[PDB]
Every structure is written in C-alpha cells, then in structure tokens.
C-alpha cells in the first residue's frame, strides 16, 4: 500500500521525464546554423552566421541572431558500421523503445489492481521497467559517439532527464521486483501454516 | 539493477537463494570494478 505509492509516482516520473526529453529540443549546446542555405538572398552568400544552438533529437535551433527562433530539422545522412550509426540516431528507435517500454511498466502496474492474484503483472512491470532503462544507456551512448563524427559543446535539461529517467526507471524496477518478491514470499508462508 | 533482478526475481528458487540482493549486487559490482 506504501511501497506501491513510490512505484507508482516514479513510474509516472520517469515516463514524464523520458517523453520531455524526446519532446524537447535542449540535448546539446553547439555552435551552428538553423536557417537553409540562402542561394539567392545572399545573406551570407553560402556560409550562414555560426552562432550558439540548442540541438536535440530532430531540429536545431538558434538562441542569439536575426534569426532567433528559427528550427531547422536535424540532417543526418549528409552528402557500414558509419551507415547503421546513422540510422540509429536518425531514428532514435532506442529513445523512443524507452518510452515505449517506460508506457508498458505503467500499464502492468495499472493492471496490478484489477487481478490481485496474477502476480507474473508485478514482475512484467519491473522487466520493462529495467530493460527501459536498458534502452537508455544505448540511446545516450548512440547519441553521444553519433555527435562525435562532426564538428564548445554542452550539454542541456533535456539530456539530464533522459539521464534522470534512467535512474528513476532503474531504481523503480528494483521495487516492482522486490513486490514481486514480497508477493510471493507471503503466498509460502500461509502455505506453510 | 540487473544482477539484483536475474538472482532474487524468481520464487522457485527461495531462505534466500543468494545473498545477491540490492545493496549487495551494488557492493559485487563496486568490487569488480576496482579491481
Ligand atoms: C521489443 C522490446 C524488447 C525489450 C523489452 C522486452 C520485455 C519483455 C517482457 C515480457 C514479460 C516478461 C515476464 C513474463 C512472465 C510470464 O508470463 O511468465
Ligand atoms: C518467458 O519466456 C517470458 C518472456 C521472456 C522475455 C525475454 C526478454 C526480456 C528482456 C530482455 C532484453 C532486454 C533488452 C532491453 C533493451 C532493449
């Protein structure tokens, strides 16, 4: 009854936290362009005005400039091993598998008052709870050694609330598993008396 | 996180069947790095 509570408010936590993370666009403080190449109005005939952006997981932005606020979508494939990196982060199937499985934890648990003798719902919860996490650690590091194959850099909210929502699901996991745990260990007990 | 799940989730194996729980998966895996 108290123990449920801490799962069920982390779980809300780290589902939030992951879908703001995924939503928002504060992962990286780079210093690039967010406006498409001016051919014919010349601004800066080619090369735009390098200034301080806010990437994330889609577009970049622009803080400083004529041009604050402008968002231009993330390309990745530009011009192997180089090629499914790229379609990995091009995607971001990973931080988005961690939504999916974050989304899946809450079910299990939402299902876990409604049959109180299926205790295999407990235990799915905590799965998908760890294995989301999981997904996270390959996300960040996709993201991380995907940013390193191009040209100061920080790093933004958004990406310490994937790194947070990992935490949450983690330590969330262990605490479905160890109800798992309590559950069963109170069905042995009576069968043993 | 993940050697606490795979060594105490399942009931047909407990009293306990290790010591591998929580705190001390976290103390295993703290060892193991060190070296
Ligand atoms: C496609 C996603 C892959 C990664 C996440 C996979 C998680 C699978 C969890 C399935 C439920 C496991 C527990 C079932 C218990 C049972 O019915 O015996
Ligand atoms: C009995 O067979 C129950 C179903 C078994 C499910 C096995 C898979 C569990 C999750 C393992 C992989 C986790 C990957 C996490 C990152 C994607």
């Keep these: 009854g108290v123990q449920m509570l801490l799962t069920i408010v982390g779980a809300f936590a780290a589902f939030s936290l992951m879908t703001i ?50 968002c231009k979508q993330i390309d990745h494939f530009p011009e192997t091993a180089e090629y499914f990196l790229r379609a990995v982060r091009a995607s971001s199937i990973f931080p988005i598998l961690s939504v999916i499985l974050l989304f899946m934890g809450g079910l299990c648990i939402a299902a876990s008052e409604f049959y109180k003798t299926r205790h295999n719902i407990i235990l799915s919860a905590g799965i998908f709870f760890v294995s989301a996490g999981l997904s996270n650690i390959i996300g960040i590091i996709v993201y991380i050694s995907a940013n390193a194959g191009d040209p100061s850099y920080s790093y933004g909210w958004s990406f310490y609330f994937g790194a947070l929502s990992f935490i949450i699901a983690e330590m969330v996991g262990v605490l479905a598993v160890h109800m798992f745990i309590d559950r069963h260990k109170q069905l042995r007990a009576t069968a043993r008396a | 996180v993940v050697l606490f799940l795979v060594s105490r989730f399942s009931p047909y194996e407990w009293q306990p069947p290790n010591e591998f729980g929580i705190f001390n998966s976290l103390w295993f895996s703290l060892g193991a790095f060190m070296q």
């Design chain 1, 21 to 70: 993370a995924v939503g928002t666009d504060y992962w990286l403080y780079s210093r690039g362009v967010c406006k498409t190449k001016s051919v014919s109005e010349n601004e800066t005939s080619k090369k735009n005005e390098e200034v301080m952006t806010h990437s994330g997981l889609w577009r970049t932005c622009c803080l400083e400039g004529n041009f604050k606020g402008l």
